[PDB]
Ligand binder design. Sequence first.
Ligand SMILES: CCOc1cc(=O)n(C)cc1-c1cc(NS(O)(O)CC)ccc1Oc1ccc(F)cc1F
Length: 108
Amino acid sequence: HMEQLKCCSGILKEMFAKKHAAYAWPFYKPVDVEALGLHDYCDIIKHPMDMSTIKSKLEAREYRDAQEFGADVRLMFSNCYKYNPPDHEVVAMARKLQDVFEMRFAKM
Ligand SMILES: CCOc1cc(=O)n(C)cc1-c1cc(NS(O)(O)CC)ccc1Oc1ccc(F)cc1F
């Protein structure tokens, strides 16, 4: 249980690294509704998620097991697929970052 949570920090650190930075940058900080002009984001997305919030929740003790961590990382991607159109640039970036997460998260 304790060993799994330490590995979860390693997955988040890889996602934050310069290697994946080209498609991981719109997921670093929370979705800015006022700056981008996304008036209906809070209406459609009920539970918003970002890499900084997952990092903060992990830095504390919000997740009991790795499954709770995974559910939050998958929520971040699910929010991107629900709100944005299927042909948007951020959707393709979410798929590439999910490919990185799913590969490392499965190997534990
Ligand atoms: C209209 C798309 O807006 C978003 C919806 C969404 O679901 N996500 C996860 C992110 C963004 C998003 C948020 C920020 N700015 S921010 O400070 O909030 C985060 C750094 C910056 C870019 C963002 O996306 C893109 C927008 C245009 C483009 F050409 C490619 C993009 F990738």
